[PDB]
Amino acid sequence: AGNATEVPANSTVLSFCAFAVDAAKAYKDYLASGGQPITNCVKMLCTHTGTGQAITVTPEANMDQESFGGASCCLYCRCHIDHPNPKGFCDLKGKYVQIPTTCANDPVGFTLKNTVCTVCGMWKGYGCSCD
Amino acid sequence: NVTGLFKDCSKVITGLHPTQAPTHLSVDTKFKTEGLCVDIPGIPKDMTYRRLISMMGFKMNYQVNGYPNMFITREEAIRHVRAWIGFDVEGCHATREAVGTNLPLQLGFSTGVNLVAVPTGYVDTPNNTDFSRVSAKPPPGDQFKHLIPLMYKGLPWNVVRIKIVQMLSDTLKNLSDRVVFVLWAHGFELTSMKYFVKIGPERTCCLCDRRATCFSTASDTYACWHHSIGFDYVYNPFMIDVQQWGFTGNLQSNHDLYCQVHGNAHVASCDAIMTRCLAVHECFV
Ligand SMILES: c1nnc2n1CCCC2
Ligand SMILES: c1nnc2n1CCCC2
Ligand SMILES: [Mg+2]
Ligand SMILES: [Zn+2]
Numbered sequence A: 001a002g003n004a005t006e007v008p009a010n011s012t013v014l015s016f017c018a019f020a021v022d023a024a025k026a027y028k029d030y031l032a033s034g035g036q037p038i039t040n041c042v043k044m045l046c047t048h049t050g051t052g053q054a055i056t057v058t059p060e061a062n063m064d065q066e067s068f069g070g071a072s073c074c075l076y077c078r079c080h081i082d083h084p085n086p087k088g089f090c091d092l093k094g095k096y097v098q099i100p101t102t103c104a105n106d107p108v109g110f111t112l113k114n115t116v117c118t119v120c121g122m123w124k125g126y127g128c129s130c131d
Numbered sequence B: 001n002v003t004g005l006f007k008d009c010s011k012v013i014t015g016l017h018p019t020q021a022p023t024h025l026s027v028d029t030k031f032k033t034e035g036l037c038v039d040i041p042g043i044p045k046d047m048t049y050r051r052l053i054s055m056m057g058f059k060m061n062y063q064v065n066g067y068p069n070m071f072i073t074r075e076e077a078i079r080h081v082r083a084w085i086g087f088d089v090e091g092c093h094a095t096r097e098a099v100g101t102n103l104p105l106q107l108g109f110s111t112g113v114n115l116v117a118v119p120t121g122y123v124d125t126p127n128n129t130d131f132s133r134v135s136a137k138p139p140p141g142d143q144f145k146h147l148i149p150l151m152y153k154g155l156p157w158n159v160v161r162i163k164i165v166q167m168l169s170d171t172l173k174n175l176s177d178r179v180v181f182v183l184w185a186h187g188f189e190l191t192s193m194k195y196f197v198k199i200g201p202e203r204t205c206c207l208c209d210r211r212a213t214c215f216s217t218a219s220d221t222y223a224c225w226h227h228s229i230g231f232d233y234v235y236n237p238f239m240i241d242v243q244q245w246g247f248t249g250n251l252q253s254n255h256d257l258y259c260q261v262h263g264n265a266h267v268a269s270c271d272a273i274m275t276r277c278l279a280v281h282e283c284f285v
């Protein structure tokens, strides 16, 4: 009974991060030890004529980005663990995330390590026009 | 190919919206095309769902620098025989709003301890994962008729894990700097460990030079077995699966070949006692 949500290639990384005290440090250490990035993300078929903003209500990828469903890019959503804030809520789940094409091999790792500019809504170091 | 780890156990006939689905597999079929997904304006997100996610299928075979391995060799388990604690869990089945997973009900240890927990699962919502009580039924059978009263005699997991840490600390403070759980068909016990175990790099106690065996979420501190009062998590435990040593039959039939003083009272603690006993006889004779 029930419907599978995962593939066997993700078992090791998800099990490791699901038991960790610090899951974010666990995933970065997993990658640093040669471990494969989390796969089976929700990659979107989109026009690539979007605004380029980082977190959007609809896919907004430009020609240098890939759009993904937000929950699928969140380590906490992928591992079914607590989100690291007092309210315990997610900023990616229920939204779409634009990831640079060069980093689309690891969408979970990208959102973990990067921040969105509060002023222009673009990723810092990847489209943020502010100084 | 798919795994049973994180299997969606809800009875909802539709899948998830692309923004809420943790994976491509769990996205509803309406949104799938060309090996990708599409956003369909007019088909909105679901803001009220509660989907039970199965914790059956964990695989602790990570190779990460500075993170000790949970599953140890027979030769390393032999060196740490003073740390051996037999462990078994009798579970109950998810029911009503979910079907397809087992939840911890009776946790048994070779120390003779049985702890009853409220049936609790990991339920996905539009905002997060809610660790909460779920509807459950004891396994359909007559050798599990003793589990029916336990459905109403359970304690909340925040209490159960404090009791586990306390029992292990009392038992192991003068015996070892570790815990080695001695298991038989480890699957469900590893699932049950998700409810009271945390892992990471090796740490030291906050009050002494001994290695840390316990963790506290409230203070983000680590403690050895001597200073863990009030701690809620078992930190960096070790374990071994006795079933994997080439035995052909079930636990009781292999145990009974070497020992005639541990009867099968059919309770979780009794299986944990038999598991450790068989491990002792097989390893040291
Ligand atoms: C659920 N998802 N993240 C969290 N929670 C509960 C409270 C701690 C943080
Ligand atoms: C039984 N199960 N675990 C233990 N024992 C007796 C000796 C101490 C540790
Ligand atoms: Mg049993
Ligand atoms: Zn999330």
Ligand SMILES: [Zn+2]
Binding pocket: A117, A118, A119, A120, A121, A122, A128, A129, A130
């Ligand atoms: Zn900016």
Ligand SMILES: [Zn+2]
Binding pocket: B205, B206, B207, B208, B209, B210, B223, B224, B225, B226, B227
């Ligand atoms: Zn100490």
Ligand SMILES: [Zn+2]
Binding pocket: B255, B259, B260, B261, B262, B273, B274, B277, B278
């Ligand atoms: Zn025995």
